[PDB]
Design a protein around this ligand. Structure first.
Ligand SMILES: NC(=O)c1ccc[n+]([C@@H]2O[C@H](COP(=O)([O-])OP(=O)(O)OC[C@H]3O[C@@H](n4cnc5c(N)ncnc54)[C@H](OP(=O)(O)O)[C@@H]3O)[C@@H](O)[C@H]2O)c1
Ligand SMILES: NC1NC(N)C2C[C@@H](CN3CCC4CCCCC43)CCC2N1
Length: 206
């Protein structure tokens, strides 16, 4: 009973699969973040009294976020890391691997807890994404496609939008995306601060 839930990868990347630039962060998308927060926070109203989603991220990602929005409120935060020394936090968890975090979540948030898990989201880390892509529970990717060949030094590990993977990963209909995210979501591209991007949902059979 350690895999009673599937994982979801959420990420923003360019057509060239770039996801990072020597720390920097190649683009200004206030609306994208808004979508991000909305997707990773959404939970069925009925079971909203206790249920909460989870966000797993690598150390680098945790640092990349300003003290301001740390930790992500309304969501269970768990940072993955091996070398854990003077780890701060207050309500955040710590795990040495993707599977280790899961087992901790199922033991810390079992039926004996007043807080039940709803959806697990893998939100950050080129490395964490690597581990996730190879995971047997990951069957969904919430991707934001940035149609701008900017410069990046960190890329997504697997070209799921390319022909070579077309028999495995399939892009869902827009309405299906809106359905999974519950609330409404923009169709087509969204221009913001000189950037054109779009939201897509991809899934595969396990
Ligand atoms: N545009 C965006 O939305 C966005 C979101 C997040 C980050 N970023 C960017 O992307 C870059 C970072 O990429 P990244 O791959 O280095 O970062 P990451 O995955 O967030 O952090 C790498 C750290 O994560 C831990 N880790 C990851 N996978 C692990 C595993 N399977 N087992 C144990 N520990 C694991 C390791 O910590 P230990 O070394 O402590 O073991 C490793 O040094 C940053 O420069 C940042 O600017 C962009
Ligand atoms: N689609 C999508 N998937 C993800 N995994 C995302 C990681 C988010 C991490 N955050 C939250 C607040 C931040 C402030 C400064 C730097 C990085 C910050 C940013 C937007 C994302 N979009």
């Amino acid at each position: 009973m350690n895999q009673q839930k599937s994982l979801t990868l959420i990420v923003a990347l360019t057509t060239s699969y770039g996801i990072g630039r020597s720390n920097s962060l190649p683009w200004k998308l206030k609306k994208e973040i808004s979508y991000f927060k909305r997707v990773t926070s959404f939970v069925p109203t009925f079971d909203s009294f206790e249920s909460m989603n989870v966000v797993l991220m690598g150390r680098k990602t945790w640092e990349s976020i300003p003290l301001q929005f740390r930790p992500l409120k309304g969501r269970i935060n768990v940072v993955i890391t091996r070398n854990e020394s003077l780890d701060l936090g207050n309500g955040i968890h710590s795990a040495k691997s993707l599977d280790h975090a899961l087992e901790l979540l199922y033991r810390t948030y079992g039926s004996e807890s007043s807080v039940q898990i709803n959806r697990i989201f893998v939100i950050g880390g080129a490395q964490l994404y690597k581990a996730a892509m190879d995971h047997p529970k990951l069957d969904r990717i919430m991707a934001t496609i940035i149609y701008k060949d900017i410069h990046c030094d960190v890329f997504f590990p697997l070209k799921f939008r390319d022909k070579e993977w077309s028999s495995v990963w399939k892009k869902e209909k827009h309405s299906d995306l809106e359905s999974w995210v519950g609330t409404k979501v923009p169709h087509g591209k969204i221009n913001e601060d000189g950037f054109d991007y779009e939201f897509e949902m991809w899934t595969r059979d396990l």
